[PDB]
Ligand binder design. Structure first.
Ligand SMILES: *[C@@H]1O[C@H](CO)[C@@H](O)[C@H](O)[C@H]1NC(C)=O
Ligand SMILES: *[C@@H]1O[C@H](CO)[C@@H](O)[C@H](O)[C@H]1NC(C)=O
Ligand SMILES: *[C@@H]1O[C@H](CO)[C@@H](O)[C@H](O)[C@H]1NC(C)=O
Lengths: 23, 23
């Protein structure tokens, strides 16, 4: 989904640890 | 497994998110 439908929402960054792994 | 063992399996491409970032 996109952040244009959900009734209650917040802003935080999903880490996806692989970026660290790649570098 | 190996592709031969399963029945009705269809040739297709599976995409990996990690490879693009690495390159
Ligand atoms: C009620 O809940 C919504 C999320 O569904 C939130 O945006 C809102 O701030 C809340 N308001 C009150 C008055 O509880
Ligand atoms: C699926 O059904 C068709 C019927 O035309 C058949 O040719 C095919 O062998 C079947 N798939 C199998 C057994 O995986
Ligand atoms: C595609 O499927 C056929 C099934 O007859 C197989 O012979 C062929 O090797 C497959 N293609 C691949 C692995 O690229």
């Amino acid at each position: 989904g996109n952040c244009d439908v959900v009734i209650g929402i917040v802003n935080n960054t999903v880490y996806d640890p692989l970026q660290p792994e790649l570098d």
